[PDB]
Amino acid sequence: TARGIVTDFAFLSPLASSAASRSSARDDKLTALLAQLDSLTRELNVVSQQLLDLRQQVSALKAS
Amino acid sequence: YPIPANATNVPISIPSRNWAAFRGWAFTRLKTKETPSLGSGYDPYYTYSG
Known part of the structure; x- marks a missing residue:
């Protein structure tokens, strides 16, 4: 316990000065996630109807 | 400048000085x-x- 608690706070000492540039670096990167993970999800749900029609392209014609 | 946890992108800090x-x-x-x-x-x- 004597050494375990102490380690976590002190090692962020040179990082202490760059507090302002990171809080705002973060926000805009999360705005970047808003579009980059919208476009990407949209590609998956479309495969939903493409494979559903591909299902009935094969299942109806393999039969005859 | 350290790299805590799962980390990739970090910028520089110090501005005000003369670059000789x-x-x-x-x-x-x-x-x-x-x-x-x-x-x-x-x-x-x-x-x-x-």
């Missing part, structure tokens, strides 16, 4: 457990002598 004449630029990377804070002699969290 250089020779080159160099990067490097070391663990915080491997190398202690300089200017003491003995530190509690330095338990890696290798």
